[PDB]
Amino acid sequence: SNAQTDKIDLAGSWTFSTDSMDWSRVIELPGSMASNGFGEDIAVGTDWTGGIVDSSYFFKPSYAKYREAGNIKVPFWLQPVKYYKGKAWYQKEVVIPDSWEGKDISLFLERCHWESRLYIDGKEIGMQNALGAPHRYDLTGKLSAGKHVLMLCVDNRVKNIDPGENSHSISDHTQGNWNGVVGDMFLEVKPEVNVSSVKIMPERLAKKVSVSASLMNRYEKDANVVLEMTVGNEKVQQQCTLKPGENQVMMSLAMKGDIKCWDEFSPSLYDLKLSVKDADSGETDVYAERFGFRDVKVKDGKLTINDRRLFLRGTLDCAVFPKTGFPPTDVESWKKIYTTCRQHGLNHVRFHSWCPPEAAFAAADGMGMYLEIECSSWANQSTTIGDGGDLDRFIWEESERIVREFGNHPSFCMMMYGNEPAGEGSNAYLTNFVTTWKERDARRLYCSGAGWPNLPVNDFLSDSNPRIQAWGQGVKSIINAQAPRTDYDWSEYIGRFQQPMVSHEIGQWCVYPNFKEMAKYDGVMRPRNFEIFQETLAENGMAHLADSFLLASGKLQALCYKADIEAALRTKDFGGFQLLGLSDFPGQGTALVGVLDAFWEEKGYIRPEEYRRFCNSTVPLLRLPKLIYTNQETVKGSLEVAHFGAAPLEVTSTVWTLKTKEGKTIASGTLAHQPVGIGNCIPLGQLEIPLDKVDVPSCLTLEATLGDYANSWHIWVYPAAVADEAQLLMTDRLDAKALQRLQEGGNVLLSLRKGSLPAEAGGEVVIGFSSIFWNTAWTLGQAPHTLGILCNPAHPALSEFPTEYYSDYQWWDAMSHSGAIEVVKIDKNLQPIVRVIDDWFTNRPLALLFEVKVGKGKLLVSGIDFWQDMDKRTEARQLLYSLKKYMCGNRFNPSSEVDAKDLSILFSI
Numbered sequence: 014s015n016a017q018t019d020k021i022d023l024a025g026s027w028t029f030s031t032d033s034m035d036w037s038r039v040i041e042l043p044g045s046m047a048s049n050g051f052g053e054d055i056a057v058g059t060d061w062t063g064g065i066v067d068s069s070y071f072f073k074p075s076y077a078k079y080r081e082a083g084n085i086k087v088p089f090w091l092q093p094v095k096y097y098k099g100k101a102w103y104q105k106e107v108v109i110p111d112s113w114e115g116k117d118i119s120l121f122l123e124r125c126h127w128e129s130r131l132y133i134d135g136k137e138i139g140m141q142n143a144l145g146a147p148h149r150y151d152l153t154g155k156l157s158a159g160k161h162v163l164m165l166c167v168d169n170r171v172k173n174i175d176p177g178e179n180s181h182s183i184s185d186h187t188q189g190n191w192n193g194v195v196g197d198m199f200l201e202v203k204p205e206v207n208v209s210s211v212k213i214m215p216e217r218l219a220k221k222v223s224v225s226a227s228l229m230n231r232y233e234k235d236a237n238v239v240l241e242m243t244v245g246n247e248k249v250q251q252q253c254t255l256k257p258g259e260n261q262v263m264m265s266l267a268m269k270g271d272i273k274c275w276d277e278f279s280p281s282l283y284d285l286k287l288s289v290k291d292a293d294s295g296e297t298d299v300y301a302e303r304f305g306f307r308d309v310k311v312k313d314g315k316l317t318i319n320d321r322r323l324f325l326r327g328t329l330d331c332a333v334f335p336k337t338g339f340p341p342t343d344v345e346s347w348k349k350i351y352t353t354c355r356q357h358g359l360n361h362v363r364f365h366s367w368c369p370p371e372a373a374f375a376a377a378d379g380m381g382m383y384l385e386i387e388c389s390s391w392a393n394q395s396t397t398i399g400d401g402g403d404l405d406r407f408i409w410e411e412s413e414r415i416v417r418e419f420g421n422h423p424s425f426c427m428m429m430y431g432n433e434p435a436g437e438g439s440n441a442y443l444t445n446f447v448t449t450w451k452e453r454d455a456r457r458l459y460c461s462g463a464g465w466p467n468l469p470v471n472d473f474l475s476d477s478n479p480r481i482q483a484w485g486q487g488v489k490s491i492i493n494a495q496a497p498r499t500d501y502d503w504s505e506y507i508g509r510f511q512q513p514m515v516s517h518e519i520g521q522w523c524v525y526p527n528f529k530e531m532a533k534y535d536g537v538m539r540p541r542n543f544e545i546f547q548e549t550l551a552e553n554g555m556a557h558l559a560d561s562f563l564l565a566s567g568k569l570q571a572l573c574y575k576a577d578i579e580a581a582l583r584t585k586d587f588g589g590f591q592l593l594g595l596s597d598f599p600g601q602g603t604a605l606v607g608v609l610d611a612f613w614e615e616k617g618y619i620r621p622e623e624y625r626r627f628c629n630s631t632v633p634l635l636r637l638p639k640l641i642y643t644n645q646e647t648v649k650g651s652l653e654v655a656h657f658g659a660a661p662l663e664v665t666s667t668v669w670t671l672k673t674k675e676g677k678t679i680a681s682g683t684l685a686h687q688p689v690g691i692g693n694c695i696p697l698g699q700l701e702i703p704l705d706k707v708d709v710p711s712c713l714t715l716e717a718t719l720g721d722y723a724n725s726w727h728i729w730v731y732p733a734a735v736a737d738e739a740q741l742l743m744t745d746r747l748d749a750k751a752l753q754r755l756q757e758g759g760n761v762l763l764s765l766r767k768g769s770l771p772a773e774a775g776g777e778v779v780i781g782f783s784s785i786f787w788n789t790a791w792t793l794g795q796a797p798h799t800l801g802i803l804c805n806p807a808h809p810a811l812s813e814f815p816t817e818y819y820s821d822y823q824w825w826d827a828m829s830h831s832g833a834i835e836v837v838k839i840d841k842n843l844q845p846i847v848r849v850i851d852d853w854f855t856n857r858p859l860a861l862l863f864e865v866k867v868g869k870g871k872l873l874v875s876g877i878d879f880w881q882d883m884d885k886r887t888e889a890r891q892l893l894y895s896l897k898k899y900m901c902g903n904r905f906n907p908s909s910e911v912d913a914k915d916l917s918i919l920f921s922i
């Protein structure tokens with residue numbers, strides 16, 4: 014029966030108009046125009062908000078069917094149901110009680126997009142233009158008792174202030190340039206002496222709580238007030254005199270008992286109550302907020318929380334919410350995201366060029382997540398920062414709004430201006446920005462911007478260099494250019510700095526689109542891009558491979574993230590990393606770089622428990638120089654641990670096992686070591702495993718268990734050391750000797766020299782071992798163009814080559830010494846022995862191995878070069894042996910007949 018009589022909830026039906034003349038429709042708030050079905054239909058000439066790097070949609074004939082009216086499908090991001098970028102008017106009648114007359118009145122709008130102007134009965138009151146903070150209007154003396162008509166004019170266009178066309182606060186890459194009001198919307202009444210805002214400053218070691226409160230005195234004379242502050246059983250009361258207007262009082266509170274600190278492993282929170290009581294009127298205004306005791310500091314060039322060494326395992330949030338476009342303002346929505354993040358072993362979230370609503374901070378407070386917030390800007394491409402533009406003052410005002418609203422949350426641990434800044438005066442601007450904030454508020458750590466610039470005044474550094482795949486690196490990266498290994502780290506680069514460093518947007522490994530998730534898009538955003546990819550896949554006769562492409566490419570994607578994350582954990586005294594990402598990025602051409610979809614939900618190729626094995630607060634790490642051995646070699650490696658738990662791990666023993674796929678233990682041992690303290694690169698022991706007893710070509714799993722934490726790695730062991738040119742002819746060209754053998758009915762193995770495959774037959778496909786980087790649209794075709802392999806292990810051609818249906822490290826040699834053959838240009842019904850998964854933008858049937866029948870003879874075609882450096886390629890010799898034993902065997906009968914001249918497309922002069 015209790016009610017909130019001091020507020021008037023404004024959520025409901027508003028009279029709507031896009032020209033302030035036609036008021037024939039009604040809109041529902043909270044919500045956008047798009048979430049209400051209002052706006053214009055998506056057309057080719059839609060004035061989007063964000064860059065489009067690959068413009069093939071507008072010009073190439075393959076997108077012609079998607080440029081016609083009635084079938085507009087856009088490939089570069091999720092497509093909203095409607096679009097509108099301009100002024101919109103919202104109107105609603107309210108009834109102000111008599112008891113509100115002459116009192117403190119204010120309007121609260123949690124999220125507008127973008128600029129809002131308030132009118133009371135046609136009289137303009139003021140303007141608000143916050144992107145990542147609420148809109149507030151002081152209505153004291155401006156709103157009398159009785160019926161009144163509130164009107165809002167919300168403008169979502171980019172005008173004087175361009176924060177960056179790709180900023181996730183406005184851009185159609187993720188959140189979309191919506192128009193409306195979202196979140197809590199209410200009128201609030203307060204006594205003539207009230208609390209406007211509170212800055213909470215807990216002192217962990219001093220056992221104190223300091224508060225700088227902004228008090229309001231609506232009287233025209235001085236006011237005698239009583240100020241009571243309560244934190245649990247501790248109370249401090251204070252009587253002072255308030256001058257007319259705003260007042261800045263500062264109070265302290267001593268904590269008698271022990272203080273429970275806030276961190277990843279124990280997110281303890283305290284309740285603060287601050288009340289002000291006017292002595293004349295007896296009216297009391299009460300303010301309440303949660304807070305936590307924690308100190309995130311840089312001690313001796315290393316990140317610490319509460320004097321404990323800290324390591325950040327983070328992922329990005331780019332305001333992706335396809336159900337609504339605009340962000341959710343409930344705690345449960347964010348509780349889900351933080352929960353699945355922690356389920357994958359993460360403790361950190363970076364918000365890319367936008368600030369989330371209050372619920373994201375409150376959820377992270379109880380979860381113990383470390384948040385890094387940015388000020389709604391990616392000042393590049395379209396604009397610039399630090400050159401005297403209107404953006405310069407906006408970022409200052411936006412950061413002050415963000416710290417005033419959310420600065421008391423313990424999860425607010427780091428802050429930057431935004432992402433990847435541009436501007437000749439941006440270094441100077443960001444230097445003043447970081448320096449001033451470090452002086453204003455020491456409750457958090459500050460960095461200039463994400464990715465760059467490294468300023469000496471930064472608390473920590475954000476750098477993109479310490480990662481596997483750099484922009485433009487392509488096939489020259491470690492994962493692609495060198496044989497598999499797990500003994501590399503970034504310790505050399507980060508050793509050049511006296512500041513802690515956090516990786517910037519690591520991973521970016523792609524998966525094939527998951528068409529099953531298309532049913533989840535029942536809201537504002539529709540996956541029309543997925544509809545294009547799915548249609549072209551079917552047009553190339555591969556509609557039945559959609560789920561296999563998802564699972565096979567996802568197994569390879571998860572392998573790449575494991576490699577990137579373990580490389581960061583092997584870097585001594587690394588500050589941390591920020592994944593891009595755990596979830597998908599639906600924009601910038603379609604950057605499917607996550608093991609979770611745009612809804613932070615699972616896809617089905619890696620379980621969070623398996624992700625948590627290599628990405629966790631305590632992770633065993635194995636350093637091996639290679640992963641391909643013979644029965645005459647000895648596995649020589651080292652075992653270490655990256656332990657960043659709440660306390661040292663009281664374990665003096667590590668147990669390792671080398672087991673087969675069936676579970677049989679080939680080797681095992683126990684490593685003795687001292688108790689594990691907080692840090693990484695902590696040695697556990699050395700491994701020296703002879704492999705003479707390993708029979709047959711085998712894939713072995715090396716698992717290491719430290720206490721409750723276990724991690725595993727794969728190695729492949731082959732024999733140390735089926736051919737007679739009469740029976741099997743292997744050649745690089747279909748010459749006279751090869752064509753004669755096929756006329757005679759013999760068997761021929763065609764192995765193409767690497768680089769000899771002409772562009773017509775698939776030479777244009779730059780094949781590599783890793784997954785695609787970001788996406789070939791945004792990168793304008795950076796290598797690789799492939800997404801792993803797809804094969805049937807039960808195929809007799811692979812009987813001597815251990816493998817699953819998906820790509821793994823033993824396939825690095827195949828992907829690195831080959832070209833992908835476009836088999837449709839030979840015969841459209843050709844079934845590959847080992848298929849290559851092509852980029853989803855092209856959906857070309859690709860193959861590394863296939864077989865055809867040329868007359869009476871049988872031909873096995875291989876895009877893999879089985880010629881060069883075969884003494885160093887142990888895994889290539891094994892695959893070649895498996896093929897030769899198959900061809901000389903009983904079950905080599907190619908059914909697809911083809912002519913000799915049809916195969917001439919594999920050669921050029």
Ligand SMILES: O=C(CO)[C@@H](O)[C@@H](O)[C@H](O)CO
Pocket residue numbers: 064066394433484791
């Ligand atoms: O450099 C990067 C990495 O953030 C790209 O986002 C840009 O180069 C875009 O291609 C600019 O359009």
Ligand SMILES: [Cl-]
Pocket residue numbers: 736737738741742743
């Ligand atoms: Cl031979």
Ligand SMILES: [Cl-]
Pocket residue numbers: 839840841842
């Ligand atoms: Cl054909």
